[PDB]
Amino acid sequence: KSCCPNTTGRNIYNACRLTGAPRPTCAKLSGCKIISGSTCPSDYPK
């Protein structure tokens, strides 16, 4: 699962991936957290 902190970031993340970029990169570019669990951490509610 690819969660995110701020709403703004979540948006940029989608765009990055929409182009064909990897999860990791986009996660660091926008600021989204990449985990395995099926839930979002308190830190990244978005």
UniProtKB/Swiss-Prot annotation:
Disulfide bonds join 3-40, 4-32, 16-26. Belongs to the plant thionin (TC 1.C.44) family. This is Viscotoxin-A3. It comes from Viscum album (European mistletoe). It is found in: Secreted. The chain holds residues 27 to 72 of 111 of the full protein. The gene is THI2.1. Thionins are small plant proteins which are toxic to animal cells. They seem to exert their toxic effect at the level of the cell membrane. Their precise function is not known.
